[PDB]
Amino acid sequence: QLPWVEKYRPQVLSDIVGNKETIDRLQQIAKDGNMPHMIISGMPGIGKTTSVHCLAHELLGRSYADGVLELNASDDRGIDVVRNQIKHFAQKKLHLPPGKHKIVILDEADSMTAGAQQALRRTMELYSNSTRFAFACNQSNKIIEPLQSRCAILRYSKLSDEDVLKRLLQIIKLEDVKYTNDGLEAIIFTAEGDMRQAINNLQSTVAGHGLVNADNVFKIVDSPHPLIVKKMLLASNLEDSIQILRTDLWKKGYSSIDIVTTSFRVTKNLAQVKESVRLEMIKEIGLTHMRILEGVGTYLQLASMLAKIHKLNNK
Amino acid sequence: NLPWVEKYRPETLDEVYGQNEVITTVRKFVDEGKLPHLLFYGPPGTGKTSTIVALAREIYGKNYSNMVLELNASDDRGIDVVRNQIKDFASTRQIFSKGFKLIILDEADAMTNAAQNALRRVIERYTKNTRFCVLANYAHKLTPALLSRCTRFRFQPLPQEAIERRIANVLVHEKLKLSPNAEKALIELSNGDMRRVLNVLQSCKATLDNPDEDEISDDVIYECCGAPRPSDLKAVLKSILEDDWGTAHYTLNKVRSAKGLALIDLIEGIVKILEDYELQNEETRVHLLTKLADIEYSISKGGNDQIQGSAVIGAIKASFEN
Amino acid sequence: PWVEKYRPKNLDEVTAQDHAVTVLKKTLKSANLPHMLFYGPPGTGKTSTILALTKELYGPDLMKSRILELNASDERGISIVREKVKNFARLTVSKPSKHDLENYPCPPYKIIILDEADSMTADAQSALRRTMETYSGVTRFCLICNYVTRIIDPLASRCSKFRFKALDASNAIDRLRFISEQENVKCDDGVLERILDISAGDLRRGITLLQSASKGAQYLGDGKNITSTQVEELAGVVPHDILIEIVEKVKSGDFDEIKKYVNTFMKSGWSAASVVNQLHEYYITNDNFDTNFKNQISWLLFTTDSRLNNGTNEHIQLLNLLVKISQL
Amino acid sequence: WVDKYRPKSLNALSHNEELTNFLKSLSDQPRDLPHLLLYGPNGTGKKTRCMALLESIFGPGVYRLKIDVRQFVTASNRKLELNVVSSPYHLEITPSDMGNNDRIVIQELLKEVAQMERYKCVIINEANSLTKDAQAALRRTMEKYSKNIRLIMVCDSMSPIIAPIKSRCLLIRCPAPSDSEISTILSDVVTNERIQLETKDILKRIAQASNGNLRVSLLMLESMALNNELALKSSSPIIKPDWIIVIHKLTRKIVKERSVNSLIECRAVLYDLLAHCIPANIILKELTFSLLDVETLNTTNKSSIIEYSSVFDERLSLGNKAIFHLEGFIAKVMCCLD
Amino acid sequence: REEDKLWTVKYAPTNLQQVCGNKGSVMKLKNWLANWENSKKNSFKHAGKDGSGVFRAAMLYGPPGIGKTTAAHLVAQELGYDILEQNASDVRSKTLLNAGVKNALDNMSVVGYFKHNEEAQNLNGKHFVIIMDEVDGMSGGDRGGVGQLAQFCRKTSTPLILICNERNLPKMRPFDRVCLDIQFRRPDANSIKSRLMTIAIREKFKLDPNVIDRLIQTTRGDIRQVINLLSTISTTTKNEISKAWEKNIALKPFDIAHKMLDGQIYSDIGSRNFTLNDKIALYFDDFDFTPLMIQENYLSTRPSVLKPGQSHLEAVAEAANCISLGDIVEKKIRSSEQLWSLLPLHAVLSSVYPASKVAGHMAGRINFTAWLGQNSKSAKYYRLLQEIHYHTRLGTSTDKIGLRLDYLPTFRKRLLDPFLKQGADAISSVIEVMDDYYLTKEDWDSIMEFFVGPDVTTAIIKKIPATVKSGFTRKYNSMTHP
Numbered sequence A: 001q002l003p004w005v006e007k008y009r010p011q012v013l014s015d016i017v018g019n020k021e022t023i024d025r026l027q028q029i030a031k032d033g034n035m036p037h038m039i040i041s042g043m044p045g046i047g048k049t050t051s052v053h054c055l056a057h058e059l060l061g062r063s064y065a066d067g068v069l070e071l072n073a074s075d076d077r078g079i080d081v082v083r084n085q086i087k088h089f090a091q092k093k094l095h096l097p098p099g100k101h102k103i104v105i106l107d108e109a110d111s112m113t114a115g116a117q118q119a120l121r122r123t124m125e126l127y128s129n130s131t132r133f134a135f136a137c138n139q140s141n142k143i144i145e146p147l148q149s150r151c152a153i154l155r156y157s158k159l160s161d162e163d164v165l166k167r168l169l170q171i172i173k174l175e176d177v178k179y180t181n182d183g184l185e186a187i188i189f190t191a192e193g194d195m196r197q198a199i200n201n202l203q204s205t206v207a208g209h210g211l212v213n214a215d216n217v218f219k220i221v222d223s224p225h226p227l228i229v230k231k232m233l234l235a236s237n238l239e240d241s242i243q244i245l246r247t248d249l250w251k252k253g254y255s256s257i258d259i260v261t262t263s264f265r266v267t268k269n270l271a272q273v274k275e276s277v278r279l280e281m282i283k284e285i286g287l288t289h290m291r292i293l294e295g296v297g298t299y300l301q302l303a304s305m306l307a308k309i310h311k312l313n314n315k
Numbered sequence B: 001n002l003p004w005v006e007k008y009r010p011e012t013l014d015e016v017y018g019q020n021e022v023i024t025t026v027r028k029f030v031d032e033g034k035l036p037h038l039l040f041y042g043p044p045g046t047g048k049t050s051t052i053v054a055l056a057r058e059i060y061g062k063n064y065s066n067m068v069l070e071l072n073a074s075d076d077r078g079i080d081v082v083r084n085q086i087k088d089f090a091s092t093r094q095i096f097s098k099g100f101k102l103i104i105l106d107e108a109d110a111m112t113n114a115a116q117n118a119l120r121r122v123i124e125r126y127t128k129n130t131r132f133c134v135l136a137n138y139a140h141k142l143t144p145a146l147l148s149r150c151t152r153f154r155f156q157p158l159p160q161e162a163i164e165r166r167i168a169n170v171l172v173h174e175k176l177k178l179s180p181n182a183e184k185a186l187i188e189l190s191n192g193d194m195r196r197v198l199n200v201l202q203s204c205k206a207t208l209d210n211p212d213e214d215e216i217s218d219d220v221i222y223e224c225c226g227a228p229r230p231s232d233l234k235a236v237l238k239s240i241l242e243d244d245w246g247t248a249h250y251t252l253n254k255v256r257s258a259k260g261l262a263l264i265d266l267i268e269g270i271v272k273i274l275e276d277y278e279l280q281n282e283e284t285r286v287h288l289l290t291k292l293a294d295i296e297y298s299i300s301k302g303g304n305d306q307i308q309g310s311a312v313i314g315a316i317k318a319s320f321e322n
Numbered sequence C: 001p002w003v004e005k006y007r008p009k010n011l012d013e014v015t016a017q018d019h020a021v022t023v024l025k026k027t028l029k030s031a032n033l034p035h036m037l038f039y040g041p042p043g044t045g046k047t048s049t050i051l052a053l054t055k056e057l058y059g060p061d062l063m064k065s066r067i068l069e070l071n072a073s074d075e076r077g078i079s080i081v082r083e084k085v086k087n088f089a090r091l092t093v094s095k096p097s098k099h100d101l102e103n104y105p106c107p108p109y110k111i112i113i114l115d116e117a118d119s120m121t122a123d124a125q126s127a128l129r130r131t132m133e134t135y136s137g138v139t140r141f142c143l144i145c146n147y148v149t150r151i152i153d154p155l156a157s158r159c160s161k162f163r164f165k166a167l168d169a170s171n172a173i174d175r176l177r178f179i180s181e182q183e184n185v186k187c188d189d190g191v192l193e194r195i196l197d198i199s200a201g202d203l204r205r206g207i208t209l210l211q212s213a214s215k216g217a218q219y220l221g222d223g224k225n226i227t228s229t230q231v232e233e234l235a236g237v238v239p240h241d242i243l244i245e246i247v248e249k250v251k252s253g254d255f256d257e258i259k260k261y262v263n264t265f266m267k268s269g270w271s272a273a274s275v276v277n278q279l280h281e282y283y284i285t286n287d288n289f290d291t292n293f294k295n296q297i298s299w300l301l302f303t304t305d306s307r308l309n310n311g312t313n314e315h316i317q318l319l320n321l322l323v324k325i326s327q328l
Numbered sequence D: 001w002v003d004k005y006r007p008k009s010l011n012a013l014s015h016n017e018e019l020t021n022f023l024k025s026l027s028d029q030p031r032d033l034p035h036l037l038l039y040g041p042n043g044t045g046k047k048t049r050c051m052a053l054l055e056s057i058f059g060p061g062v063y064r065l066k067i068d069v070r071q072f073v074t075a076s077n078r079k080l081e082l083n084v085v086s087s088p089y090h091l092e093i094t095p096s097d098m099g100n101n102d103r104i105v106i107q108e109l110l111k112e113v114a115q116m117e118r119y120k121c122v123i124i125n126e127a128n129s130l131t132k133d134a135q136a137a138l139r140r141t142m143e144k145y146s147k148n149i150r151l152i153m154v155c156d157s158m159s160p161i162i163a164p165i166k167s168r169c170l171l172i173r174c175p176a177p178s179d180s181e182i183s184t185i186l187s188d189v190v191t192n193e194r195i196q197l198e199t200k201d202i203l204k205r206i207a208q209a210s211n212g213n214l215r216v217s218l219l220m221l222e223s224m225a226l227n228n229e230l231a232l233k234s235s236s237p238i239i240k241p242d243w244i245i246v247i248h249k250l251t252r253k254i255v256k257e258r259s260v261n262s263l264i265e266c267r268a269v270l271y272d273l274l275a276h277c278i279p280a281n282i283i284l285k286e287l288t289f290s291l292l293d294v295e296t297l298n299t300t301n302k303s304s305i306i307e308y309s310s311v312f313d314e315r316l317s318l319g320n321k322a323i324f325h326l327e328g329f330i331a332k333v334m335c336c337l338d
Numbered sequence E: 001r002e003e004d005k006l007w008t009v010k011y012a013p014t015n016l017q018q019v020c021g022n023k024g025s026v027m028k029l030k031n032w033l034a035n036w037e038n039s040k041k042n043s044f045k046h047a048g049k050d051g052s053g054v055f056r057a058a059m060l061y062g063p064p065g066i067g068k069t070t071a072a073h074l075v076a077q078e079l080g081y082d083i084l085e086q087n088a089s090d091v092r093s094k095t096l097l098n099a100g101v102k103n104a105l106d107n108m109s110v111v112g113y114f115k116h117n118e119e120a121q122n123l124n125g126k127h128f129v130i131i132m133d134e135v136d137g138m139s140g141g142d143r144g145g146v147g148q149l150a151q152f153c154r155k156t157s158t159p160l161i162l163i164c165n166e167r168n169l170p171k172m173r174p175f176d177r178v179c180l181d182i183q184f185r186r187p188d189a190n191s192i193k194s195r196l197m198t199i200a201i202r203e204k205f206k207l208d209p210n211v212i213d214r215l216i217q218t219t220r221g222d223i224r225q226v227i228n229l230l231s232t233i234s235t236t237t238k239n240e241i242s243k244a245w246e247k248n249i250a251l252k253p254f255d256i257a258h259k260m261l262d263g264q265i266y267s268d269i270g271s272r273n274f275t276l277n278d279k280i281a282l283y284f285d286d287f288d289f290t291p292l293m294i295q296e297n298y299l300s301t302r303p304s305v306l307k308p309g310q311s312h313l314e315a316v317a318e319a320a321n322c323i324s325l326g327d328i329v330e331k332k333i334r335s336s337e338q339l340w341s342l343l344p345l346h347a348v349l350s351s352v353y354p355a356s357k358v359a360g361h362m363a364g365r366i367n368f369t370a371w372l373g374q375n376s377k378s379a380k381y382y383r384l385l386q387e388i389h390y391h392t393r394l395g396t397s398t399d400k401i402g403l404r405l406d407y408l409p410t411f412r413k414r415l416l417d418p419f420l421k422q423g424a425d426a427i428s429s430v431i432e433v434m435d436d437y438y439l440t441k442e443d444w445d446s447i448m449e450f451f452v453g454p455d456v457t458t459a460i461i462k463k464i465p466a467t468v469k470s471g472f473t474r475k476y477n478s479m480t481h482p
Ligand SMILES: Nc1ncnc2c1ncn2[C@@H]1O[C@H](COP(=O)(O)OP(=O)(O)OP(O)(O)=S)[C@@H](O)[C@H]1O
Pocket: A004, A005, A006, A008, A009, A010, A015, A016, A017, A018, A043, A044, A045, A046, A047, A048, A049, A050, A051, A137, A138, A167, A195, A196, B145
């Protein structure tokens, strides 16, 4: 076996589908050569590490093995490491083309201690002629102010439905798997902008049931079906909604967090009802979510959420 | 003298009940030799740990102690242990092994974001030389990157058949007699948790059996585990509904004091009883559910219990006027 | 303190909880005393009965040599439970003298009391499991706690569970009368039940309150009976006269008068939030208000309590509650 | 000025004769002093009462104190340098600088102080800012060290205090001084400083304007005595702090003009007030208690303003950006008054 | 080379007339380093007309990237001195400082000697300027570094310049009186605009003066940041148009706010062309700045989606209620980092709902959020108030908050007020008063700094002559109570 999130990883900067302007800027940087220190921030699973990896590859060509120092969460990143190894790598002699430079790729920089990030300022400022730093973090708020001041911030937005759909189309074209539009829509729904999670769910569905159909996708994701959730959030009488929640969703052992998240994601795409009622139902669902997350996942909370949703949909 | 929670533990795969859907799949997986990282998540008292230890035993034979690394919750694992111990165990090659090593983390949902990132990176780096298994009670508390690396398996609580079969088995290996309504009370109070059943059974065995042959009634099983009683619940409900304020308040205080019950159990039982009533107005149900959920959320933060009890009484009374 | 001069030293002096003392009295005559898991509210008689059992089974000579007391206050880390507690569990029992054998049956095991088991680390209890089970022949434990959920299940199987019920207001009056007689403290008529109601459940609070109030009234050198007012003034509760003043002001009045009165109250009056609880008790126990009134009174009091339970400002919430309860 | 005439002994305290009598009655047992919890509004003289009971029990050398700074370390490498005011017989702990080490510094520091040595006094200033875990640690400390530590905890409105602490100390309250008793203290001060008082109505005016705050009354008397050349006449422009005037102007702007264009200036004033070391709850108080005193409003408007203030106070206690809740409350007030 | 370098390096200052902003602090540092020789000749006892003739060490501090290190290095290199620089990337422990730098305290440079010593250029070329940079960054791997550096701030024979970011931090306490601490502030917008215009005219590209001001607003005064962000336009090659670069990557939050505040999206026709999911995804384009921008400019729009009977004020009140709720959600999110799933709820409660409530046309121009500047100002002032309370706790016996609400109005009447009417002979009384409370000149400024409202003291302070201030400064440096 081989994970499809690892076999179909983009190795060139052009294969990455997503934010077009940032990718164009990175392509121009790789074509020119003058690359500055950069912090890449964004949500998980939208191609942050892969982006800087393809950037370093296209920049260094055959020198990736000698002019790239990658540090992830597995390696030790303390005071001694930053003071010794990074410093000795920055001063390391290397003959490169006039535009290229050495690259230090620090993945998950938001996990590095403040003291360790402190000892990198002068290291990255004094050796700016032969060393360029590339940090990759999920939260740009945990990086100290001098570091954020020294490098340019590149924000990555969540993936739209069209780009994920095109990537899945390319994957199924190259993999020769049978599918339907309903299964693709279900995968886009359950992926909520996570390309890696989308590819993983597609591979799981293919390996489990072969045919990519909405039923198989919602069976392998082990989440409440959006159809029955929409039926619960649109009943005319509150009694039928409570019965649907009791017999069909609560008896099957579904987690309250999963039920609330599915109701949230269904109310967002419920194009039938108006905008104000959608926003208010989303507010109520989020209040119920906050109540559940605070240590009380009682069925009474979901019952009250349904009661409020019904009262708001009737008023 | 070993506990029934530990004595009746399934030592192999065929002795876990109510989880056939996952048992057949894991059997096929260990028979095809394509065992990936497994994320066993679900409510407690279901059989995750027993299933995984039985699988590890069936795979490794006598090499269990040398080829299986059992790791637990926080245990002072800030960033150090996941960085050194797990990494070495995944990197250290055994001396006479033909295969891969297994590291099983129990209730690993309590790890911090940095620890979860370190763990997922370790899994990514050594996915070819070892396999990982993570146990969890809530799959939402884990980083969405760790989920996309392994295969998930939800452990839906045991149905009635598995629990009654296990009650039969524990009655075979122990001289106890159980009343027909005793097993009904047990399955109603268990909520599909075998651990609590095996905990409550030994307690009643220890306390009640003077000649080791008595009959366990609903009274003792309700008293030991500290659970409400349906008759008492209905009496409190009727007293709140029909009688006036002084009498209903006094009855509620007497019930919640002379038996040692908490307001959370009273509220959930009251709403469970009210679920099936044929009330005329729907605004009644709306107000009832809203106010009861508000009272429960406020109780969750530890207020003055008398005030929330009076508020429960007032809400129940004021909702039934339409 | 009178809580120490009059602590129960024998198993008969404890009269509040009787359902647990009788079975241990039946069992002490046998050397198979299992490990114990006592759970219950604070100030019910846990340590009293524990020390009483220890005293009546071992005697004053061996109180220190073979009975250990460890609390949450002292260090109890994994290192301690693996070095000190473990060695004390494996140390051979001492030789009791002939005087002890002549008055007390010396059991072939030790007594280690680790009270307050709620706030123990899971690592510590998981280690103490094996620290306790393998040495059951020469060591037995008794863990004290308030909530059974804090201790892990394997530490509750071998240990028999004992719930110390909250003492009732009917059997606790005799002990208060007893402690009143053994000290020649002159009390008034209707004060004992007020002390019991103020310190409901926790009899220790009532004992300390009575002691402190008697000692504070003795300084006056009057020798008069100790009234209910000087008792309720040390518990932090709002007096009844100012409470009646608040109720009369809120029964019929304008916004300005209520605001000025609550300003004066927060300025110089009692600065406790128990006024809400007293208003709750008064309005609910009263028999001159209608049902539609009680509904809204209870709801408003619950809302005010939920607001005040978030570290908010007392003055604003109290004024809002008073205005809302006046608008009805 | 205010600190120069502060009574440094129980015999010099000229307020709350009953409380001073109780303190002199308690100070006849230097060996068995029970734990003590003082509560009452600010500016009443409870810290003065503690530092005077200590002077009456111990020697007069308790006032000559020195401040030390000690570093403590948490699980990680965060070293925090907490400051402690120590005396040859007592020390003071103010848990207002740490937010999470409340259970880490106390249970250790007390653990340290009861081992060198006839007890020692630990004054826990602002005993209400302690999270329940710190309160449990302090209860454990009171339980274990009873022969060496005597806790005198100062606080106000002791509602967020657990029962294990309440039931183990003497609960003493300090009511605010009456105006007839604040005027006396102001008279002693103006006599000791040869101030030319034309009549006695100035002292009553200051007492009524300070709302029982004794130290604020003395301080505003000082502030008004340095502006009239130490000659306080009947034409007395009662001095208000630099922020109360701004809050009153903001209230008047709220009452006069109710629109968004004025809400912009209201938010600007809130920005000017917040960044200059002023908490959120103080602003919310001084705005609500100043919007209810306007005579141009009726009962319904005030009854809605107090409800909105009670809601937004709870909302402030559950957030981190105070300007958001303040602007929301101001917008609700504007919408209701219209 | 010429192009492989960065822009913050190739356009770094070379003299002291190119450093934009903070002319007073640079001039003070230069005049101190110059008169250092005469001060050493006078045994550091005679205050040389400014009170800076007694201080052995200078301490530079301020916001990041404003010119501290650059100005220090340039001042050291202009007077002919030799620089010995040590940074956070070196192990500054107690023993290493005792061995490495301590021995070089009173020596002469072999580099400065063998470089040039024959021509009569300056007699201090054989000396040391010891630049301890990033003093606030000494982590747990540097035990005793602060105490040893404070001891080195005295008992020295060469200029010792300390650089940090937050001076009022409790860690930097031992540097209370032993070092001359001058404050570098955020440079004015005009100097940054002039520097950016010079960089642009040297780089052969023209920018709209509005984009420059908006960049200055989003950067909050960081000059290195504006240089790094200006080095990004060079990527846009393949004109007379650069709207894409500004609206997409650099100035993204402004475009996000402009798109979210458009009333045409929430109309019935536009609701289906741009659904709710599109707005929730628009939020995720930048989730760290969108709520702040929304809260900043949600009440400066002319609405067109009002209800039949709902005015502007009620809609604004409802939007502010939703903003408060979203702030509560944001606090819950950022209080526990494993709650990444609450992001869409915070998006709806903070950005989507208020925008949908008060959408419409933009009255004026979209301004950057002002909460960041006020938050930094409030943090700095909290640090200042704590540093003040640490020096007066011995005689006040009040909480750290009570010192500001009550005691500072009277301190104004006692400290600053006499200077207005009495002239210049009340310095003794003010010095006595501040000595009774262990106060200093920096503490005097910090006290006289807050005073918001009708009691603003900045105009009054700048109104007094320079002679009285200089006299008070050089007179306080002689008498010391503690
Ligand atoms: N824009 C994209 N186009 C194509 N494939 C993508 C894209 N983004 C992600 N992927 C796929 O997702 C896989 C994993 O994405 P990563 O870049 O490793 O995640 P990430 O961006 O680093 O976020 P983290 O590491 O969880 S914080 C890649 O190997 C790709 O196969």
